Amino acid sequence: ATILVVTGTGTGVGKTVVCAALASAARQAGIDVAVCKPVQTGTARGDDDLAEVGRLAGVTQLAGLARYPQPMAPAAAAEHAGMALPARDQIVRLIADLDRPGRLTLVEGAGGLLVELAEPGVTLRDVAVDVAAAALVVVTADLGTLNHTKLTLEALAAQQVSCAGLVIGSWPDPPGLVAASNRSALARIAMVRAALPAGAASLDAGDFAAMSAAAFDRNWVAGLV
Amino acid sequence: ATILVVTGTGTGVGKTVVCAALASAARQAGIDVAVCKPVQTGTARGDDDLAEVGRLAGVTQLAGLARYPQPMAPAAAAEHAGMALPARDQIVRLIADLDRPGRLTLVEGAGGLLVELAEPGVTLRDVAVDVAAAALVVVTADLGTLNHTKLTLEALAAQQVSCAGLVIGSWPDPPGLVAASNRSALARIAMVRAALPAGAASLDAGDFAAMSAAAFDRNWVAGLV
Numbered sequence: 001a002t003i004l005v006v007t008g009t010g011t012g013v014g015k016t017v018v019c020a021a022l023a024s025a026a027r028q029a030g031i032d033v034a035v036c037k038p039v040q041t042g043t044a045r046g047d048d049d050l051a052e053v054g055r056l057a058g059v060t061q062l063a064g065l066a067r068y069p070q071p072m073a074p075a076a077a078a079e080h081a082g083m084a085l086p087a088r089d090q091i092v093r094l095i096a097d098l099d100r101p102g103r104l105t106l107v108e109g110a111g112g113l114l115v116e117l118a119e120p121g122v123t124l125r126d127v128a129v130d131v132a133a134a135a136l137v138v139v140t141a142d143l144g145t146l147n148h149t150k151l152t153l154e155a156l157a158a159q160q161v162s163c164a165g166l167v168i169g170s171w172p173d174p175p176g177l178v179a180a181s182n183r184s185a186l187a188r189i190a191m192v193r194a195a196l197p198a199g200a201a202s203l204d205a206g207d208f209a210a211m212s213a214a215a216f217d218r219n220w221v222a223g224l225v
Numbered sequence: 226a227t228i229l230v231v232t233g234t235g236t237g238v239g240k241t242v243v244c245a246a247l248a249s250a251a252r253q254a255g256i257d258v259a260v261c262k263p264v265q266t267g268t269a270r271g272d273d274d275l276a277e278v279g280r281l282a283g284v285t286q287l288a289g290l291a292r293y294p295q296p297m298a299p300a301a302a303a304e305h306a307g308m309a310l311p312a313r314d315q316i317v318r319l320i321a322d323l324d325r326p327g328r329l330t331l332v333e334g335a336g337g338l339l340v341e342l343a344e345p346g347v348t349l350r351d352v353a354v355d356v357a358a359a360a361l362v363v364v365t366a367d368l369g370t371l372n373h374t375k376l377t378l379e380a381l382a383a384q385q386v387s388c389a390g391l392v393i394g395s396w397p398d399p400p401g402l403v404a405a406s407n408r409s410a411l412a413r414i415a416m417v418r419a420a421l422p423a424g425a426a427s428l429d430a431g432d433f434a435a436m437s438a439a440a441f442d443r444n445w446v447a448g449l450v
């Protein structure tokens with residue numbers, strides 16, 4: 001029963017595409033995969049990350065909980081719809097019901113690691129502690145990422161949430177000086193599990209699966225479960 | 226003899242314009258101001274943060290140690306240039322020498338809080354501990370700012386660096402739903418000392434002075450030294 005929380009250094013760094021990529025790689029290794037989005041904001045703009053994982057990677061086991069119309073931080077999105085945040089134990093139950101031996105359960109947060117998912121001040125990091133997940137950290141290759149990554153990793157070690165590694169969510173072609181350097185530096189901060197090529201979401205079923213299996217070290221993925 | 230480290234939740238949050246705006250407000254309160262930027266990068270395209278502070282706020286005690294031509298993070302810019310960052314001792318004693326009774330000494334980093342500034346691995350945080358400065362955190366008003374701010378505040382707390390407060394480096398006009406929510410939300414996390422209007426960096430000195438004197442609570446400024 002392997003639970004893996006998929007966080008990121010920010011909003012829009014590619015958490016969702018990494019989830020699909022990692023799900024795809026794992027399924028291609030015969031590993032059962034469930035993906036879980038406990039807090040989904042922006043549904044009124046049409047955002048639905050579970051649907052994107054499904055479309056991209058063919059995952060059928062998709063689990064949602066809270067959905068808010070506005071594209072905001074959950075607390076703001078909720079209060080705008082006159083809705084409340086889910087309870088901490090509500091989020092943990094969701095993940096727990098998905099968890100089982102042999103299965104890789106991916107939990108994609110909302111935005112970065114310390115976004116509030118439940119009141120008071122409950123975040124993905126607290127959730128990680130409760131389900132004993134490790135955390136996969138999705139990062140950009142852009143200027144500013146080293147700080148953001150170091151901050152997120154520190155935040156994680158602060159509650160002894162293991163770090164499963166880094167994934168560069170979007171990797172330009174060709175990479176510029178700044179992108180190249182940041183990769184080398186990021187790799188020194190932590191294990192870089194993969195660097196997904198820019199625009200991977202434009203790929204069709206096969207192209208995505210092909211990309212995904214190329215992207216991750218097969219021994220790492222096999223060894224997740 | 227007040228030293229104040231000015232740091233940001235990322236690149237381009239407006240650290241420089243906040244240094245200048247506080248320096249300006251402080252001067253108009255009768256306080257002597259020094260700004261220190263020990264490492265300046267991106268000189269090949271004219272990046273000169275100290276000069277901006279000079280033009281906007283009229284500060285004259287503007288001190289620096291290193292100028293790397295590449296628009297990168299110091300350590301990377303240095304390695305591209307084939308020359309080490311300055312030694313830890315250089316930065317701390319520069320700041321220490323700037324410091325004097327009756328004076329506000331602002332120290333501006335390069336990017337975010339855990340960016341390496343000196344050899345070896347010395348960050349702006351280590352510097353703040355060494356010179357016993359409080360830390361002023363420049364933030365955005367954009368989606369993602371709550372996470373970035375909380376990560377930065379946590380990192381500051383983990384080494385017992387006090388937080389002088391937050392400043393939104395660029396307040397949009399009109400604000401829009403996210404920015405309006407975030408300004409309230411940042412105030413729930415830490416004191417919001419000021420929110421500088423978008424575009425303030427293009428102001429001439431006189432206009433910048435007037436904006437600055439309105440941007441901060443005068444008592445807080447007065448009580449800084």
Ligand SMILES: Nc1ccn([C@@H]2O[C@H](COP(=O)(O)OP(=O)(O)OP(=O)(O)O)[C@@H](O)[C@H]2O)c(=O)n1
Nearest residue numbers: 012013014015016017111170196197199200201
């Ligand atoms: N290798 C990649 C990485 C990202 N994307 C695109 O870039 C955007 C950002 O990716 P996403 O996974 O949605 O970002 P998240 O980190 O998941 O942002 P959020 O917090 O809103 O879920 C998406 O439209 C996605 O299709 C892409 O084309 N290919």
